[PDB]
Structure 1
Amino acid sequence: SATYPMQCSALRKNGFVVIKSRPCKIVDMSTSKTGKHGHAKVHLVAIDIFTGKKLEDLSPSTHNMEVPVVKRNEYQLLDIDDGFLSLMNMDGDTKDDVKAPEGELGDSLQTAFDEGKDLMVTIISAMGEEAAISFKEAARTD
């Protein structure tokens, strides 16, 4: 399956959750007892990985929250044209479906490709939507 359930108390920091059908990454967790007799409630503050928005929530601790599958994958650039990166996989597979980043990451990547470094791109998959998060340079195998 694309996504799998988990418990709120089983969740912990720097893990992925589904909040309002968005892949989110937790920055804050806090548990407070509801009433003296009652079970504690979990307050979750998380950041969407793709959009960067802050989404929070409060559930029972025993409640089950949905968790996505996030895969980070490593590729080499071939060209940046029309806002669409062209990447090259190990064993020689090529994809052009990735859109170029639109922020300061995209600006730095564009300048780095213009001045000619060999750039290593990390793109993540979660719940059927695809994006690029970071780039490095290959220190060896020039």
Structure 2
Amino acid sequence: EEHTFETADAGSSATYPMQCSALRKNGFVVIKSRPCKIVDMSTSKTGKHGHAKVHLVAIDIFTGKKLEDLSPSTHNMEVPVVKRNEYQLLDIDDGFLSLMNMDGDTKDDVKAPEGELGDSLQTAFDEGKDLMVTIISAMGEEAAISFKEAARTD
């Protein structure tokens, strides 16, 4: 009678901004229109009647390069949103990895890690034993972050 169903997507969402004086070590900030995690945080006076600035230094989550910024602290630096998927890792096929959500096993994607830490995972796979590997979807960027393995489950 009618068809094609026009399947699309979900609506809304965003990356919530905050006041830039509340940021903390291992806070998450967008500089360069790129996500980051703080490492060095610094505040200062300007001169006499100081309206205090803040000079952060933040090392990327994804790329890894060390970035910096300086702004007065009231005006917002918009904060990205972060989540762990806690995926379980089955065999790594081609250049991708293959991750199994508990509910569903789809989505091998995730490129496999650029990470040097992902090399120990690359090394320890053939030895096996439940590979439970978290990733983060922050701003639609997803790459392997940490390796973890349970000790039992039989």
TM-score when normalising by structure 2: 0.86
Query: How far off its partner does 1:116 sit?
Result: 2.2
Structure 1 gap segments, 5+ residues each: none
Q: Which moved more, 1:91-100 or 1:61-70?
A: 91-100
State the identity %: 100
Q: What SS does the corresponding residue of 1:106 show, helix, strand or coil?
A: helix
Count of residues in correspondence between the two structures:
142
Once the two structures are TM-superposed, the CA of residue 69 in structure 1 deviates from its matched residue by: 0.4
Q: Give the C-alpha shift of residue 91 in structure 1.
A: 1.8
CA shift for structure 1 position 30: 0.9
Q: Are 2:53 and 2:70, in contact at CA under 8 Å, matched by a contact in 1? A: yes
User: Normalising to structure 1: TM-score of the pair?
Assistant: 0.93
Choose the corresponding residue for 2:125, options 113, 116, 129. Answer: 113
Q: Which residue does 2:140 correspond to in 1?
A: 128
Q: Distance in 2 between matches of 1:106 and 1:11?
A: 29
Q: Equivalent residue for 2:95?
A: 83
Shifted more, 76-85 versus 99-108: the winner is 99-108
**Divergent runs of 4+, >4 A:** none
Question: How far off its partner does 1:92 sit?
Answer: 3.0
Residue of structure 2 equivalent to 1:26: 38
Please list every run of 5 or more consecutive structure 2 residues that lacks an aligned counterpart in the other structure: 1-12
Deviates more, 1:74-83 or 1:98-107: 98-107
